[PDB]
């Protein structure tokens, strides 16, 4: 098993505010889409409801939301009620989709780490987690989004 973590932040660690992501970057969008489709996503219960109508569930991959209620009703996910519950009902390449709370409950677990760093000097009320010692990431050159946003790509592995 391999347990990924991906998520877009601000370059001071800011990843959502008032229960939206406060930025558009759509080569962010398709490189997250590319990365996860077929795979297993595994999802806090407020990214579950931040996402738009249209995709959610997140088309072709399966959807699994985390709540402590056991009888919350994703229509086309499933709901869980713990992080062994969601690596259980996951297939061997799970994605860890979001939001802050459930990216520090998988990062002890974690295997790798897809993060776009994004310049925006945005505020936001959810973080994302933080990386200490055990991790390995190459640099890649800041790239300029049509939508004007100057954004990064990094890819941290396990030491
Ligand atoms: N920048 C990015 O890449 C990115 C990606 C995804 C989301 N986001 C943003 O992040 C924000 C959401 O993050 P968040 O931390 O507020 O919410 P979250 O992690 O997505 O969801 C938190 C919820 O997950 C459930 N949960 C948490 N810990 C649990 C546990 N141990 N066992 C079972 N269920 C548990 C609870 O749901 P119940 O209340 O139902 O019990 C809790 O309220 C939004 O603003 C969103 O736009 C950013
Ligand atoms: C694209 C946002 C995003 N980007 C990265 N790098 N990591 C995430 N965890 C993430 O958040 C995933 C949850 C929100 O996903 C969306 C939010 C708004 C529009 C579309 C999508 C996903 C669309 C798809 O994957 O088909
Ligand atoms: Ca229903």
Redesign the pocket.
């Known amino acids: 098993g391999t347990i990924g973590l ?4 601000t370059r001071a660690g800011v ?7 406060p930025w558009r970057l759509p080569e962010d969008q398709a490189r ?1 889409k590319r990365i996860t489709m077929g795979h297993t996503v595994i ?6 409801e ?1 996402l738009p109508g249209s995709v959610r569930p997140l088309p072709g991959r399966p959807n699994i939301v ?4 056991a009888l ?1 009703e994703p229509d086309g996910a499933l709901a ?4 062994d519950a969601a690596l259980a009902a996951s297939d061997e390449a799970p994605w860890v ?7 520090r ?1 998988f990062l002890p677990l974690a295997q790798r780490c897809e993060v ?1 760093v994004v310049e925006a000097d945005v505020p ?3 973080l ?1 987690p933080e990386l200490g010692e055990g991790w390995v990431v190459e640099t890649n050159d800041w790239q300029t989004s049509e939508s004007g946003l100057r954004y990064q790509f990094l890819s941290y592995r396990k030491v």
């Open positions: 991906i998520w877009a932040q990843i959502g505010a008032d229960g939206a992501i997250f999802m806090g219960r407020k990214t579950w931040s985390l709540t402590r209620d919350f869980v009620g713990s992080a989709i979001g939001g802050g709370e459930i990216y409950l776009t936001g009320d959810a994302a």
